[PDB]
Design a protein around this ligand. Sequence first.
Ligand SMILES: OC[C@H]1O[C@H](O)[C@H](O)[C@@H](O)[C@H]1O
Ligand SMILES: [Cl-]
Length: 418
Amino acid sequence: MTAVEFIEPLTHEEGVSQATKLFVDTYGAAPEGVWAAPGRVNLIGEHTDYNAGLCLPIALPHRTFIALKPREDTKVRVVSGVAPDKVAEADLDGLKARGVDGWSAYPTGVAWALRQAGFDKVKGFDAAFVSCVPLGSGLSSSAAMTCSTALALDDVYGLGYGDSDAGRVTLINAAIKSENEMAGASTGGLDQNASMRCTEGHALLLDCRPELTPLENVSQQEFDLDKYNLELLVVDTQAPHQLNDGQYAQRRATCEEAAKILGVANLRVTADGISKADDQFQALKETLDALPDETMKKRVRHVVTEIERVRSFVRAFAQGDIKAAGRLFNASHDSLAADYEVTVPELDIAVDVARKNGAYGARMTGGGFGGSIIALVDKGQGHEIAQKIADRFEKEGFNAPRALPAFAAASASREAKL
Ligand SMILES: OC[C@H]1O[C@H](O)[C@H](O)[C@@H](O)[C@H]1O
Ligand SMILES: [Cl-]
């Protein structure tokens, strides 16, 4: 039985080359250019983004590439390099929310979102996608697809939102709106902020209070693994997970009803009230006594402690306290498992193997219910822990996992013009 596979990121050259070839093969004409948005890892601050909390993503070197040409009419053609025979075709003229299904919903929905926002310059396009953000990995293949399309449409229609950070929040809202209202997949804003606003060697300290301007809601935190002789191990469990199954939405609804019983606009209000209390334990106790439901107490107890763990992680990493940073990873997972109840055996067992084989800490990243774990480990130990996870997986009768190199990489950009 064969060694655990590592999924190497497509280079600049491979992405441009493969995106354009799929373009020419499907459409015949050359694209106007090639754009790209990365997948992401969320280091800590999970199930916080839709509660107006704190998140800390990095962008992966792993990118979705779009070759795009705008069209004179309102028709949209899209093709994906995982099925280069199925061209999906749709029409923007009079298009309604939910008006496209399948994966074509996501990129079509981006033009739909921009025309809904009053960008009357935006008509149709042909696009070809090639990605190495693994599907079902919970590393935001979704956001990589929408944010690449949103940057391409901004560029070819000359909207003027692509060449600034502040500008991209308008493209981000469009990408978010495509996923929520066209693809009908509930999403909270973490993935698309990461994909369009992270920078190399930095994590994005994202504040999700919706009243904040773009300059107020991000801080670039130094995240140089080489400084501390670290490696970030990422292992996609490949556990089975129905893409959009209602679990994520139930969570959001419980939180939204938490906030209503509590009489706050959102749980970040509640979390900030507890944090600044002398006796945080007494502050959380008085909060949970207001929620009569056992499960709702646990969801709120997760969101309150998780926001504080983001502030605690940002301090720990800047101090070079990698033991303390690892413990914060461990506490975030443990909270996701017990209090939020979004883990599965594959995630728990992968984490336990990492823990018992010298990881500073390990945790599920993104939504849960499957997908990927992340581990702060010593440089040169990633392969060994990945292979230990794979061996356990086979002993368990689980599907084989796969691992990804990971480090803080660049956000969305244009890769090619002519
Ligand atoms: O941290 C939980 C996470 O789950 C998914 O990846 C969502 O799309 C994100 O917006 C975020 O809510
Ligand atoms: Cl096909």
